Enzyme design. Sequence first.
Site, PDB file in Angstrom:
ATOM      1  N   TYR A  47       6.314   1.587 -10.194  1.00  0.00           N
ATOM      2  CA  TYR A  47       7.250   1.096  -9.181  1.00  0.00           C
ATOM      3  C   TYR A  47       8.689   1.543  -9.477  1.00  0.00           C
ATOM      4  O   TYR A  47       9.577   1.354  -8.649  1.00  0.00           O
ATOM      5  CB  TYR A  47       7.195  -0.434  -9.068  1.00  0.00           C
ATOM      6  N   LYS A  76       0.987  -2.951 -15.363  1.00  0.00           N
ATOM      7  CA  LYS A  76      -0.213  -2.158 -15.121  1.00  0.00           C
ATOM      8  C   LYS A  76      -0.082  -0.776 -15.729  1.00  0.00           C
ATOM      9  O   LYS A  76       0.980  -0.132 -15.628  1.00  0.00           O
ATOM     10  CB  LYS A  76      -0.481  -2.047 -13.606  1.00  0.00           C
TER      11      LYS A  76
HETATM   12  N1  NAP Z   1      -2.552  -3.311  -7.766  1.00  0.00           N
HETATM   13  C1  NAP Z   1      -2.226  -2.514  -6.751  1.00  0.00           C
HETATM   14  O1  NAP Z   1      -2.751  -1.421  -6.535  1.00  0.00           O
HETATM   15  C2  NAP Z   1      -1.191  -3.087  -5.802  1.00  0.00           C
HETATM   16  C3  NAP Z   1      -1.057  -2.488  -4.538  1.00  0.00           C
HETATM   17  C4  NAP Z   1      -0.169  -2.988  -3.606  1.00  0.00           C
HETATM   18  C5  NAP Z   1       0.610  -4.102  -3.934  1.00  0.00           C
HETATM   19  N2  NAP Z   1       0.500  -4.702  -5.187  1.00  0.00           N
HETATM   20  C6  NAP Z   1       1.347  -5.884  -5.515  1.00  0.00           C
HETATM   21  O2  NAP Z   1       1.288  -6.815  -4.428  1.00  0.00           O
HETATM   22  C7  NAP Z   1       2.650  -7.095  -4.010  1.00  0.00           C
HETATM   23  C8  NAP Z   1       2.663  -7.541  -2.554  1.00  0.00           C
HETATM   24  O3  NAP Z   1       2.138  -6.515  -1.684  1.00  0.00           O
HETATM   25  P1  NAP Z   1       3.101  -5.564  -0.790  1.00  0.00           P
HETATM   26  O4  NAP Z   1       4.417  -5.312  -1.403  1.00  0.00           O
HETATM   27  O5  NAP Z   1       2.249  -4.418  -0.353  1.00  0.00           O
HETATM   28  O6  NAP Z   1       3.419  -6.411   0.525  1.00  0.00           O
HETATM   29  P2  NAP Z   1       3.392  -7.872   1.136  1.00  0.00           P
HETATM   30  O7  NAP Z   1       3.875  -8.934   0.284  1.00  0.00           O
HETATM   31  O8  NAP Z   1       2.129  -8.012   1.878  1.00  0.00           O
HETATM   32  O9  NAP Z   1       4.551  -7.646   2.202  1.00  0.00           O
HETATM   33  C9  NAP Z   1       5.907  -7.419   1.798  1.00  0.00           C
HETATM   34  C10 NAP Z   1       6.755  -7.285   3.045  1.00  0.00           C
HETATM   35  O10 NAP Z   1       6.778  -8.498   3.827  1.00  0.00           O
HETATM   36  C11 NAP Z   1       8.132  -8.909   3.987  1.00  0.00           C
HETATM   37  N3  NAP Z   1       8.131 -10.391   3.859  1.00  0.00           N
HETATM   38  C12 NAP Z   1       8.044 -11.152   2.738  1.00  0.00           C
HETATM   39  N4  NAP Z   1       8.065 -12.466   3.046  1.00  0.00           N
HETATM   40  C13 NAP Z   1       8.155 -12.479   4.382  1.00  0.00           C
HETATM   41  C14 NAP Z   1       8.359 -13.600   5.186  1.00  0.00           C
HETATM   42  N5  NAP Z   1       8.457 -14.855   4.736  1.00  0.00           N
HETATM   43  N6  NAP Z   1       8.573 -13.338   6.499  1.00  0.00           N
HETATM   44  C15 NAP Z   1       8.610 -12.104   7.023  1.00  0.00           C
HETATM   45  N7  NAP Z   1       8.411 -11.049   6.234  1.00  0.00           N
HETATM   46  C16 NAP Z   1       8.194 -11.206   4.910  1.00  0.00           C
HETATM   47  C17 NAP Z   1       8.905  -8.239   2.876  1.00  0.00           C
HETATM   48  O11 NAP Z   1      10.238  -8.010   3.293  1.00  0.00           O
HETATM   49  P3  NAP Z   1      11.542  -8.173   2.379  1.00  0.00           P
HETATM   50  O12 NAP Z   1      11.203  -7.651   1.021  1.00  0.00           O
HETATM   51  O13 NAP Z   1      12.463  -7.287   3.158  1.00  0.00           O
HETATM   52  O14 NAP Z   1      11.858  -9.616   2.462  1.00  0.00           O
HETATM   53  C18 NAP Z   1       8.184  -6.922   2.761  1.00  0.00           C
HETATM   54  O15 NAP Z   1       8.582  -6.081   3.830  1.00  0.00           O
HETATM   55  C19 NAP Z   1       3.376  -5.792  -4.274  1.00  0.00           C
HETATM   56  O16 NAP Z   1       4.804  -5.796  -4.212  1.00  0.00           O
HETATM   57  C20 NAP Z   1       2.826  -5.511  -5.648  1.00  0.00           C
HETATM   58  O17 NAP Z   1       3.502  -6.321  -6.594  1.00  0.00           O
HETATM   59  C21 NAP Z   1      -0.411  -4.192  -6.128  1.00  0.00           C
HETATM   60  O1  ALR Z   2      -0.400   1.111  -6.329  1.00  0.00           O
HETATM   61  C1  ALR Z   2       0.368   0.166  -6.115  1.00  0.00           C
HETATM   62  O2  ALR Z   2       0.441  -0.793  -6.830  1.00  0.00           O
HETATM   63  C2  ALR Z   2       1.248   0.176  -4.903  1.00  0.00           C
HETATM   64  N1  ALR Z   2       1.106   1.259  -3.939  1.00  0.00           N
HETATM   65  C3  ALR Z   2       0.203   1.081  -2.903  1.00  0.00           C
HETATM   66  O3  ALR Z   2      -0.633   0.182  -2.876  1.00  0.00           O
HETATM   67  C4  ALR Z   2       0.319   2.054  -1.790  1.00  0.00           C
HETATM   68  C5  ALR Z   2      -0.445   1.917  -0.610  1.00  0.00           C
HETATM   69  C6  ALR Z   2      -0.155   2.705   0.525  1.00  0.00           C
HETATM   70  C7  ALR Z   2       0.668   3.848   0.391  1.00  0.00           C
HETATM   71  C8  ALR Z   2       1.361   4.104  -0.813  1.00  0.00           C
HETATM   72  C9  ALR Z   2       2.226   5.192  -0.980  1.00  0.00           C
HETATM   73  C10 ALR Z   2       3.028   5.315  -2.142  1.00  0.00           C
HETATM   74  C11 ALR Z   2       2.896   4.407  -3.209  1.00  0.00           C
HETATM   75  C12 ALR Z   2       1.970   3.320  -3.109  1.00  0.00           C
HETATM   76  C13 ALR Z   2       1.212   3.170  -1.899  1.00  0.00           C
HETATM   77  C14 ALR Z   2       1.905   2.335  -4.189  1.00  0.00           C
HETATM   78  O4  ALR Z   2       2.560   2.465  -5.229  1.00  0.00           O
END
Ligand code: NAP
Ligand code: ALR
Length: 314
Positions: A47, A76
Site C-alpha cells: 500500500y 501482509k
Molecule cells: N487482502 C487483500 O487482498 C485486500 C484487498 C482489498 C482490501 N483489503 C483491505 O480491506 C480494506 C477495505 O477495503 P477497500 O479499501 O477496498 O474498500 P471499502 O472499505 O469497501 O470502501 C472504501 C471506500 O468507501 C468510502 N467510505 C468509507 N466509509 C464510508 C461511509 N460511511 N459512507 C460513504 N462512503 C464510505 C471510503 O471513502 P473515504 O476514504 O473517502 O472516506 C472509500 O472510498 C482495505 O483498505 C484494505 O485494508 C485487503
Molecule cells: O491487494 C490488496 O490488498 C489491495 N488491492 C486490491 O484488492 C485491488 C483490487 C482491484 C484493483 C487493484 C488495482 C491495484 C491495486 C490493488 C487492486 C490492490 O492493492
Amino acid sequence: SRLLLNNGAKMPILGLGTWKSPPGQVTEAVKVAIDVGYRHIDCAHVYQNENEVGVAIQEKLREQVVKREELFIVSKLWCTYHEKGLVKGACQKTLSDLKLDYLDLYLIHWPTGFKPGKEFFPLDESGNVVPSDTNILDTWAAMEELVDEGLVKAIGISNFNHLQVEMILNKPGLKYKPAVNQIECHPYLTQEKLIQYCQSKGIVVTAYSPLGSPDRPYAKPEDPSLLEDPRIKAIAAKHNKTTAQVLIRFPMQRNLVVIPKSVTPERIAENFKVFDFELSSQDMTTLLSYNRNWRVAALLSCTSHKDYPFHEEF
Ligand SMILES: NC(=O)c1ccc[n+]([C@@H]2O[C@H](COP(=O)([O-])OP(=O)(O)OC[C@H]3O[C@@H](n4cnc5c(N)ncnc54)[C@H](OP(=O)(O)O)[C@@H]3O)[C@@H](O)[C@H]2O)c1
Ligand SMILES: O=C(O)CN1C(=O)c2cccc3cccc(c23)C1=O
Ligand SMILES: O=C(O)CN1C(=O)c2cccc3cccc(c23)C1=O
C-alpha cells in the site's frame, strides 16, 4: 467486540483499512480512528503507506491514549517475497516502517509468488507477470519461523481457496495453523461455502471491501454499487442507520472481522457506531440473497499462475 484466535489472542471485530489511503492523509486518519475507539489497523507493504501509518501509532502510544497490548496491527507479505530467505527481511521492513517490534498478525497477502525484485508486479517482454517457482508450503514454513523468533504473534493467509487452506492444514509437521483467512466479502459476494469451511476449522474470517470499494482503480461501465443499492438503503432506513453502517454490521453478525477503509473523520466516526443495533434474521437472509458472485479483486493478470485462487468453486 473481539473474537478469539487459535493462538489465544483476541482480535477486534472492527478494523480500519488503509489501501488507497494517501500518505499525506493516512496519519491523521489513524490518529482520529484510535481516538474514536478503533484498536485494529489493517496494513500492507504494497500500500506504500506503512511509514505514515506508523507515525500515527507512535504518536498515540506516546500520548498514552493506548497501550501497545491494546492495539492489533496487521500486515501482509507481498508476492515478490515468497522465497524462504526473503520472508524475514520483508517482515522486518514492515516493522521498521510501522515502528513496532512485533506484529499481532502477519498474512500471506496472495497465494501467488512472483519473481523477486523492485517491481511489485514483475513483467516479462510480452507483458505477463513473471511467477516464482516457490510454493505455498515452503512459504508457510518461513512464516512459522517468524512466530518462533518473536517477530509476529500470529500468522495467517489471504485470498486462499479451501483447497489451498487444506494444503496447509495437511502440511507434514505443521507447527502453527493459520489464524485468519482474509477474503473479499459483501452482499454481492457472500462467500457462504468458504466461510463455513474456514469457520469449521477454527480459522477466523476477515471481510475486506465491505462497502464494495467505491474508490477502486476502475469504475468499469454500469458497475454495481452497494452504497447506492435501493434495497439495502431500505434496510438502513428501517433501522435509522446509514447504508455503510448496515454494510459493516452485516459481516459482524456472521461472526466476521470487518475492515472498512476511510480517510474521512466523520465517516471513520460513523463506521464505529455499529455496536448498538442489530439486523434481524430476516434482514440477514435478505442481504445474503443479493449475492451475485461479483468480485472487486479478481487478480485477472494472474489467471494462469499455478496458484491462482479463483478457478475453484470456493
Ligand atoms: N487482502 C487483500 O487482498 C485486500 C484487498 C482489498 C482490501 N483489503 C483491505 O480491506 C480494506 C477495505 O477495503 P477497500 O479499501 O477496498 O474498500 P471499502 O472499505 O469497501 O470502501 C472504501 C471506500 O468507501 C468510502 N467510505 C468509507 N466509509 C464510508 C461511509 N460511511 N459512507 C460513504 N462512503 C464510505 C471510503 O471513502 P473515504 O476514504 O473517502 O472516506 C472509500 O472510498 C482495505 O483498505 C484494505 O485494508 C485487503
Ligand atoms: O491487494 C490488496 O490488498 C489491495 N488491492 C486490491 O484488492 C485491488 C483490487 C482491484 C484493483 C487493484 C488495482 C491495484 C491495486 C490493488 C487492486 C490492490 O492493492
Ligand atoms: O484483476 C482484477 O480483477 C483486479 N486486480 C488488479 O487489477 C490488480 C492489479 C495490480 C495489483 C493488484 C494487487 C492486488 C489485487 C489486484 C491487483 C486485483 O484484484
